[PDB]
Structures are given as structure tokens and as C-alpha cells.
């Protein structure tokens, strides 16, 4: 009375004989950082997502010591997920998200990229969305888009009392 599947994600198949690569699916890689990208366990009661969120295959290693792991389904919520929803609606492309594995955005280390940028440069993931800072060093190897929220090296102050 239980279902098992050989492949956790559904592979896409060539329909008949048509020379058209399925360009409308793009493995998008994200990074866990609230509130832009936040992680929720699948609702154990109904085994689904609430509609404002999106499915995402988070790869959890089996144990802190064991290197083995599974791409367990997980439910992705936030602001970047919503803007990705609107972007997918307007551009009309499907997608199969999966979270990062190295845990960081990515910084140059011995001429090697890591993290989100590392997984995007090697063309293992076409588009990358989340809380990513536009930077000069990153613009060299990766192509960015028009920013939607500003940022910088800002300062904050404790709110002083009235006088």
C-alpha cells in the first residue's frame, strides 16, 4: 500500500522525433537565507505545499558524519520565491528548484568558484535566484540582471531617546 520511485525527480523525455530541446525547464539553484529564501518542511498531514510556496528538492546528507544523502522534497517560501513565481508566469517557463549544497553564495578561492556562483559557472544550473549581491568580480564570469532591491555597506544606530 506504499509507492516507491526509481528517480526522485521526474526526468523529461523526448516526444516523438522533434528537434526541439526542452528549453522551457531550467534547474534553478538557490541559497537558504531568510526572509528572501526560507525553508519549510512538507506538511506531514497532507504531504503538499501551501500555494504561496514552491516545491524544492533540498539535498540532505543522511548524517553529519555519513557522506550519503537524499534529495528530499522541501517547501520553499519567501520573497525571491514569489518574484520567481511571477517571473515564471510572465515568461512561461517551467522549473525544478533545488537548494545549494555548499551553503554559501560563493567567493573566489584558488581560481575556483563555490556555492551558488560555483554551481552556476559550471553550467549545472542555468539561472540562480535568491539574495545575491551584484559585484564586479562576479560580473566577470557571470551575467547579472537589473537589480530589484538596493544594498550596500550601511550603518545603523541605536535609537537615541528624546531630549
Amino acid at each position: 500500500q506504499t509507492l516507491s520511485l526509481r528517480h526522485a525527480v521526474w526526468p523529461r523525455y523526448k516526444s516523438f522525433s522533434d528537434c526541439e530541446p526542452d528549453d522551457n525547464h531550467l534547474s534553478i539553484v538557490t541559497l537558504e537565507e531568510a526572509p528572501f529564501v526560507i525553508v519549510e518542511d512538507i506538511d506531514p498531514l497532507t504531504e503538499t505545499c501551501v500555494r504561496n510556496t514552491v516545491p524544492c528538492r533540498k539535498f540532505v546528507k543522511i548524517n553529519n558524519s555519513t557522506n550519503e544523502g537524499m534529495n528530499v522534497k522541501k517547501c520553499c517560501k519567501g520573497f525571491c520565491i514569489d518574484i520567481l513565481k511571477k517571473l515564471s508566469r510572465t515568461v512561461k517557463f517551467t522549473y525544478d528548484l533545488y537548494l545549494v549544497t555548499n551553503g554559501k553564495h560563493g567567493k573566489k578561492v584558488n581560481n575556483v568558484w563555490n556555492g551558488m556562483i560555483g554551481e552556476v559557472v559550471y553550467q549545472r544550473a542555468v539561472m540562480a535566484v535568491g539574495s545575491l549581491t551584484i559585484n564586479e568580480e562576479r560580473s566577470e564570469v557571470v551575467d547579472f540582471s537589473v537589480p530589484f532591491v538596493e544594498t550596500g555597506i550601511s550603518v545603523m544606530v541605536s535609537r537615541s531617546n528624546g531630549t
Epitope: 557522506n67 544523502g69 549544497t101 581560481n111 575556483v112 568558484w113 560555483g118 559557472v121 566577470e140
Partner: antibody, heavy 118, light 108 residues
Framework: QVTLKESGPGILQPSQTLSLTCSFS??????????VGWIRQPSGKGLEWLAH???????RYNPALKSRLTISKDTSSSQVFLKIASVATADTATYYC??????????WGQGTLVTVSA | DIQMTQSPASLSVSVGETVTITCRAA??????LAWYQQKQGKSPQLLVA???AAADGVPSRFSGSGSGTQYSLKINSLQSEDFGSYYC?????????FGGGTKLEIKR
Amino acid sequence: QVTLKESGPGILQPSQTLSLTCSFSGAAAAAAGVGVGWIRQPSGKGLEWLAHIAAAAAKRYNPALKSRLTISKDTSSSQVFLKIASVATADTATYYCTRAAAAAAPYWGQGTLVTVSA
Amino acid sequence: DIQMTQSPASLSVSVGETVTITCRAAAAAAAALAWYQQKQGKSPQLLVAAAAAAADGVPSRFSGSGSGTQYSLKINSLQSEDFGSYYCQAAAAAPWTFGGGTKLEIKR
């Protein structure tokens, strides 16, 4: 330890399918990173790219041969099945299954020869 | 797809001296290059990753230098285990293409 072993017939007629395979040990095919790829070495010649898969279950192919290449992984036995149908006589050379860590440089095995001709 | 034309196939040096070998590719933003050393009758193995990180078990004198398009390998003193071919690949584009190489032998 990290052992790579291949399996495939030493000869085959053209216009058929070859189902060679490789098993990798010393780690798992789903070991959070390092995967398995395949590389082709024509005899007395350079090399050409075939395919690779990582632990995260992502597969990439060679665009020139996006017609007949098929590949799958079995983490239970820690191995990789290959399926290459409609072979051509120009395939008379060796093959190399490789440990395919996330860097662009995979780590190679012993290699296996295939001879397809009349 | 990226073409990648290697160093001239006619390169060889006597045992125990310096040599430099570089393979030339497209001048786009491409530094994720991999360097291999090839054994006749055996499997080719790594020499340097990312054009600067030498692999494990690699002795010192295979210095991998260069940038841009010119990515060179420099040998202080050629020895017996250094004999073989030298291959190079670039990972910038979607198709990952290897190099041609060059055989090394005593120059007498």
C-alpha cells in the same frame, strides 16, 4: 578503497547497442558532491566528451551526440549503466569511466577497449 | 562550442632541463582550465587543477602558470616519471573539449 571497474564486450557489430557499465567504490554515487562521468579516447588521437552525473542527480550530455547517448546511476551498487544504440564503425577505440568530482577535472579509471567493425 | 589549438606537436626536451608548454584557446573569460599528464599504455592522470592548484601526489617541478589565453606548464628538471603527453581542457563553454598534446622524449 576507490575502485573503478568497467564491463563491456570486446567486440560488437555496427548499428547495434552497447550497454557497457562502470562501478565506483571508495565513496557513494550520492555522497554529497563527487559523481561519475565518461570520456572517450580514440586510438592514437585526442579525446572527446561524453557525459557526467553528480551526486545531486543532475545529468549533462555532449551536444554533438544528443541523439543516442543514455546513462543512469545505481547508488545501491554504486555503479553507472550506459546505453549507446545505433553504433557506428568509427567507435573502434577505448572508453574511460571516471570519478567526476565537482571540479572540471575528473579522476580516471583503467579504461576499456571496444572494437566495432566487420 | 570552443575550439582549442594546442602547442605545436613537435616539442621534446632532453632529460633534466626546463621546458614550457602552453595551449591556446579562445580569449574569453576562461580560467577554469584543467591540466593532465598522459601515460602510454596507462591511464592519463592530473597535473594541475584550475591552472594553479596542483593535484595531490604531484611533485614540485610541474609549475602551472599563465592566465588569459596563455596557460603554460614549466618543468625544472625532466625525469623518467615526467615522460608522457600533456593534455589541457577548458570548462567555460557548454561543450568541454580536451587538447591534442605532445609527446616528450630525449633529444639526442
